[PDB]
Amino acid sequence: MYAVFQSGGKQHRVSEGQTVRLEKLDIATGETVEFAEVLMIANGEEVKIGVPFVDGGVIKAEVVAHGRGEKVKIVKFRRRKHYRKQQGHRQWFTDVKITGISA
Amino acid sequence: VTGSGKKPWRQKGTGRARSGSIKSPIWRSGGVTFAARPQDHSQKVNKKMYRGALKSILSELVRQDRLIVVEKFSVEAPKTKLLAQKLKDMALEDVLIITGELDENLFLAARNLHKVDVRDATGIDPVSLIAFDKVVMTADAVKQVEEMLA
Amino acid sequence: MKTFTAKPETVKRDWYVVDATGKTLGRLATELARRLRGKHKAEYTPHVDTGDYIIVLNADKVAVTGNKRTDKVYYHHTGHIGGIKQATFEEMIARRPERVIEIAVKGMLPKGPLGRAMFRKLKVYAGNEHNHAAQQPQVLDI
Amino acid sequence: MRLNTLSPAEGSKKAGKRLGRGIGSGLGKTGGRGHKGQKSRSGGGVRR
Amino acid sequence: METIAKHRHARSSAQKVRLVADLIRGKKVSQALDILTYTNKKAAVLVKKVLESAIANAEHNDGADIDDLKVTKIFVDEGPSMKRIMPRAKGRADRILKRTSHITVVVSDR
Amino acid sequence: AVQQNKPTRSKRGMRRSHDALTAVTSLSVDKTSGEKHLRHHITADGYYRGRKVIAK
Amino acid sequence: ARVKRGVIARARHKKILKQAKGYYGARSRVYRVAFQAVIKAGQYAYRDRRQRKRQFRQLWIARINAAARQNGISYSKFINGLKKASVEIDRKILADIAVFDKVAFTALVEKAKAALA
RNA sequence: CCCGGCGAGGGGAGUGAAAAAGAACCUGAAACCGUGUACGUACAAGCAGUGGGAGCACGCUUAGGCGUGUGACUGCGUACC
RNA sequence: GUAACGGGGCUAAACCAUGCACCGAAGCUGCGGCAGCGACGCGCGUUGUUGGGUAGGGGAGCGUUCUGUAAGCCUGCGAAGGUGUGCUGUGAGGCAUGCUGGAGGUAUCAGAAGUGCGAAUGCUGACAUAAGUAACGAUAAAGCGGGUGAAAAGCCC
Ligand SMILES: [K+]
Ligand SMILES: [K+]
Ligand SMILES: [K+]
Ligand SMILES: [K+]
Ligand SMILES: [K+]
Ligand SMILES: [K+]
Ligand SMILES: [K+]
Ligand SMILES: [K+]
Ligand SMILES: [Mg+2]
Ligand SMILES: [Mg+2]
Ligand SMILES: [Mg+2]
Ligand SMILES: [Mg+2]
Ligand SMILES: [Mg+2]
Ligand SMILES: [Mg+2]
Ligand SMILES: [Mg+2]
Ligand SMILES: [Mg+2]
Ligand SMILES: [Mg+2]
Ligand SMILES: [Mg+2]
Ligand SMILES: [Mg+2]
Ligand SMILES: [Mg+2]
Ligand SMILES: [Mg+2]
Ligand SMILES: [Mg+2]
Ligand SMILES: [Mg+2]
Ligand SMILES: [Mg+2]
Ligand SMILES: [Mg+2]
Ligand SMILES: [Mg+2]
Ligand SMILES: [Mg+2]
Ligand SMILES: [Mg+2]
Ligand SMILES: [Mg+2]
Ligand SMILES: [Mg+2]
Ligand SMILES: [Mg+2]
Ligand SMILES: [Mg+2]
Ligand SMILES: [Mg+2]
Ligand SMILES: [Mg+2]
Ligand SMILES: [Mg+2]
Ligand SMILES: [Mg+2]
Ligand SMILES: [Mg+2]
Ligand SMILES: [Mg+2]
Ligand SMILES: [Mg+2]
Ligand SMILES: [Mg+2]
Ligand SMILES: [Mg+2]
Ligand SMILES: [Mg+2]
Ligand SMILES: [Mg+2]
Ligand SMILES: [Mg+2]
Ligand SMILES: [Mg+2]
Ligand SMILES: [Mg+2]
Ligand SMILES: [Mg+2]
């Protein structure tokens, strides 16, 4: 069984028990999050396709962790023009564990 | 730098970077580009700013309970052990002692105690008022500092 | 999750047999190139050969439009100065007919090691017989 | 009031320019003199 | 049980000595001694004396039998170069490097 | 004529891939003395093919 | 106040050489060359965070096209059909479904074809 | 004491807190040169990386993936001042 | 050297007309984050908006040596330095710790500068490359026996 949902301006195909990394959610760790905009639920040969969302479709997940991703270095360099600039970046994430998919 | 003014090698044709002086600051053993000379680092302090600073310091010592006023501060003999005993009696270790007349006995008793200094009221300076943990002033010294600043 | 990638160890490649008789050279070649690369499979992966093995029969009977049979020229240079050589399509068909299809397909495959590996799966024959009965090729109508 | 708890007034102590110490400074390389000409030179410039 | 011998500051470039060292790496010591005997290189004489020293060290200091010993490790490191002046034509001086090598031989039963 | 670019340690090693010495394949054993020797050469003790050809 | 540079200079050079690990020849050994290599690696990495998004979408599209054509429709008609059906599943997910759940992909195609009908 | 030319040089022994403090001696960087091990590399074209990525080896705490090294194949890509 | 579609190839995969789809950028939108400026209200909010840059102007910082704070604090139960590893900040950087090292180091807040290097056919030292390549200096010339020696084309007879 799996479902497709939108979060963080991106889409995710998930099954129950999976941990998925999302853009940061403003929700405390060890708390439940509901995704009620489910684009698709497939339980084998049974396929519910949202138009755009599945009727009654809900994914429940628990927030396991917040954190910052691996550091990315931004390098800008304009050869022969005496210009260089560097910046670091770490992107925030929220990890959620999928607890239930239903309609 | 000690050495000759001879051009180390001719201007052109050797395939080397052009050289003018063995004393060039680019060279090992060469001059220092902006070689230091002796300097006078002293600053002007406006008299009123000096006196204003001392008043701020003394007022702050009073607020922080670091200024201790006494009638008398004396030792009978030029004995370090006597002054050490006097200060532990008064529960002082690190202390600037300001007197009206700087007596020989107290000056001599204080010399070998590095945490203790003994001034006359004329010899106060801003750093020492701040640097010592406590300042002990005789009633006499308080009057003289009163008159000096007023 | 990360996007799926085909794995060279696990890729399934089927065997097909195509008859070139009367087929337009370039329109046959694009379908061959597509299938040698694996562009027809959902498992398509740019760095993996996911394509199929293709036997082409009757390469000598491949068709071309216009005046190409006489006027299409194949040039090659030998690497020796002045060594520019040429053959018309009709001369190529007479002498080395399998090369017409092979040349057309090679130019439509990616350049580089993987493209050369993809080309090795094409088996071109001049006539109506191949020796690959053991691979059990399925008829493919292009 | 200790010798390690005194601070100057805000704005009283601006840091001097240091020319020719790299790109990030904004005064690297030419040190604010631009490119060539008499004014770029050591001792260079015309009289009052 | 490993036993070492070294010739430090040997008068030969490491490049030349390494040609010979490569012949005997991993060999039984009796075979190594035979190889070196019939190698017509100055470095074979140098390496053979180090190998013979290593064997004598193993027997005397570490109680080994020659019969069990192999050349477990052998390597040549670059030693200090002696710098010399070679006059060339037209008053030009060249540097000559007289290269030296540090020869290490390790023998072991294991 | 001289290089325009410094050749690499890699290229140096590749050129030297043919510099390796070859060990004498095998030594012969004199039938009388039992001494090892280079084939077709006399032994160190002056034997050749079992005969004392050279004294000392 | 003479300042010697050695400790700081060493730390700066070592920082660059550590980022040049794995590079060929002087590029992992020699500061002057390693510095240029590390800058260029940074320039490419910046560019390729943008290119990665292009390359993956290109891959998803190619796979959707293959799977759509196995179900009797072109990519371009399939996408149009999904939009007319108000299906908002993105190409990453469609390409994932195309590989891992072919029956579900077929159901998406039938939905697309019905919207075009 | 032992190998060696009654060498050079070395291995033990002994001194010492330490001898990888042994006089070529405090620390002992880098370039540069080696030995060992893992992985890659003999149908393959270019600033040598970067994005993607299989396989192999070795670790590791769900038995799971994860980490570390390597990097077939592939998109893009002509150093710096 | 094909060499006047980028190539394959194409009789449309050409051209003209009409239409609907789709691809396509660091543009626009979505989601998360940082910062500048202006409003509007209480240094925090809400709101709008901006953030490609050479010369160049403005603003704010990192780190180094030295002075005070410091007869303090850390340090032989291991300082500085060296070398790894992990963590960490937008950056210069910072912190922790294994190994090496074997006696110094120095918070904080201030103060002063010989304060930061890849270039200057820069300067000094070290070490590469070409390369085990050229060369070994008059083409008067050597051969053998014996000796000595660890070893003899070169020494001695
Ligand atoms: K001089
Ligand atoms: K005193
Ligand atoms: K200026
Ligand atoms: K690549
Ligand atoms: K340390
Ligand atoms: K300090
Ligand atoms: K230079
Ligand atoms: K060489
Ligand atoms: Mg000097
Ligand atoms: Mg005055
Ligand atoms: Mg291409
Ligand atoms: Mg500027
Ligand atoms: Mg200029
Ligand atoms: Mg001009
Ligand atoms: Mg100007
Ligand atoms: Mg001048
Ligand atoms: Mg002369
Ligand atoms: Mg040139
Ligand atoms: Mg050779
Ligand atoms: Mg100093
Ligand atoms: Mg290295
Ligand atoms: Mg000795
Ligand atoms: Mg040591
Ligand atoms: Mg010492
Ligand atoms: Mg030392
Ligand atoms: Mg191969
Ligand atoms: Mg080939
Ligand atoms: Mg090549
Ligand atoms: Mg390219
Ligand atoms: Mg021609
Ligand atoms: Mg074109
Ligand atoms: Mg885009
Ligand atoms: Mg934008
Ligand atoms: Mg902009
Ligand atoms: Mg800007
Ligand atoms: Mg200090
Ligand atoms: Mg300086
Ligand atoms: Mg330098
Ligand atoms: Mg520069
Ligand atoms: Mg040289
Ligand atoms: Mg040559
Ligand atoms: Mg020659
Ligand atoms: Mg010659
Ligand atoms: Mg001569
Ligand atoms: Mg003789
Ligand atoms: Mg001798
Ligand atoms: Mg002679």
PDB file of C-alpha atoms in Angstrom, chain E residues 13-66:
ATOM      1  CA  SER E  13      71.102   6.816  -6.651  1.00  0.00           C
ATOM      2  CA  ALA E  14      67.978   5.153  -5.274  1.00  0.00           C
ATOM      3  CA  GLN E  15      66.775   4.666  -8.872  1.00  0.00           C
ATOM      4  CA  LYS E  16      69.775   2.425  -9.637  1.00  0.00           C
ATOM      5  CA  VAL E  17      69.562   0.452  -6.368  1.00  0.00           C
ATOM      6  CA  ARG E  18      65.782  -0.088  -6.763  1.00  0.00           C
ATOM      7  CA  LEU E  19      66.390  -2.007 -10.023  1.00  0.00           C
ATOM      8  CA  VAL E  20      68.250  -4.616  -7.962  1.00  0.00           C
ATOM      9  CA  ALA E  21      65.967  -4.494  -4.878  1.00  0.00           C
ATOM     10  CA  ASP E  22      62.985  -5.355  -7.116  1.00  0.00           C
ATOM     11  CA  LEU E  23      64.717  -8.647  -8.152  1.00  0.00           C
ATOM     12  CA  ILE E  24      64.694 -10.129  -4.624  1.00  0.00           C
ATOM     13  CA  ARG E  25      61.530  -8.718  -2.976  1.00  0.00           C
ATOM     14  CA  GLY E  26      59.533 -11.643  -1.522  1.00  0.00           C
ATOM     15  CA  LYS E  27      62.184 -14.317  -2.335  1.00  0.00           C
ATOM     16  CA  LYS E  28      63.649 -16.977  -0.052  1.00  0.00           C
ATOM     17  CA  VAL E  29      67.007 -15.639   1.138  1.00  0.00           C
ATOM     18  CA  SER E  30      69.100 -18.430  -0.469  1.00  0.00           C
ATOM     19  CA  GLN E  31      67.438 -17.704  -3.844  1.00  0.00           C
ATOM     20  CA  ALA E  32      67.915 -13.948  -3.263  1.00  0.00           C
ATOM     21  CA  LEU E  33      71.643 -14.479  -2.601  1.00  0.00           C
ATOM     22  CA  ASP E  34      71.974 -16.481  -5.872  1.00  0.00           C
ATOM     23  CA  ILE E  35      70.114 -13.812  -7.885  1.00  0.00           C
ATOM     24  CA  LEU E  36      72.381 -11.072  -6.508  1.00  0.00           C
ATOM     25  CA  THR E  37      75.566 -13.105  -7.137  1.00  0.00           C
ATOM     26  CA  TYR E  38      74.813 -13.187 -10.908  1.00  0.00           C
ATOM     27  CA  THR E  39      73.398  -9.658 -11.262  1.00  0.00           C
ATOM     28  CA  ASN E  40      76.097  -7.532 -12.924  1.00  0.00           C
ATOM     29  CA  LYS E  41      75.299  -4.247 -11.166  1.00  0.00           C
ATOM     30  CA  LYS E  42      77.256  -2.308  -8.548  1.00  0.00           C
ATOM     31  CA  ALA E  43      73.985  -2.098  -6.574  1.00  0.00           C
ATOM     32  CA  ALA E  44      73.858  -5.931  -6.409  1.00  0.00           C
ATOM     33  CA  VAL E  45      77.099  -5.876  -4.385  1.00  0.00           C
ATOM     34  CA  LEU E  46      75.642  -3.237  -2.013  1.00  0.00           C
ATOM     35  CA  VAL E  47      72.287  -5.001  -1.618  1.00  0.00           C
ATOM     36  CA  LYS E  48      73.912  -8.414  -1.104  1.00  0.00           C
ATOM     37  CA  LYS E  49      76.004  -7.128   1.839  1.00  0.00           C
ATOM     38  CA  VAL E  50      72.835  -5.704   3.467  1.00  0.00           C
ATOM     39  CA  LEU E  51      70.952  -8.981   2.916  1.00  0.00           C
ATOM     40  CA  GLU E  52      73.886 -10.959   4.373  1.00  0.00           C
ATOM     41  CA  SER E  53      73.942  -8.593   7.383  1.00  0.00           C
ATOM     42  CA  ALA E  54      70.159  -9.063   7.878  1.00  0.00           C
ATOM     43  CA  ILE E  55      70.569 -12.862   7.809  1.00  0.00           C
ATOM     44  CA  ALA E  56      73.460 -12.715  10.314  1.00  0.00           C
ATOM     45  CA  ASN E  57      71.377 -10.387  12.531  1.00  0.00           C
ATOM     46  CA  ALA E  58      68.428 -12.825  12.361  1.00  0.00           C
ATOM     47  CA  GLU E  59      70.616 -15.840  13.245  1.00  0.00           C
ATOM     48  CA  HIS E  60      72.712 -14.146  15.959  1.00  0.00           C
ATOM     49  CA  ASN E  61      70.307 -11.686  17.631  1.00  0.00           C
ATOM     50  CA  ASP E  62      66.904 -13.318  16.958  1.00  0.00           C
ATOM     51  CA  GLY E  63      67.703 -17.084  16.827  1.00  0.00           C
ATOM     52  CA  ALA E  64      66.438 -17.645  13.243  1.00  0.00           C
ATOM     53  CA  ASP E  65      67.434 -20.390  10.798  1.00  0.00           C
ATOM     54  CA  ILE E  66      68.562 -19.114   7.343  1.00  0.00           C
TER      55      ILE E  66
END
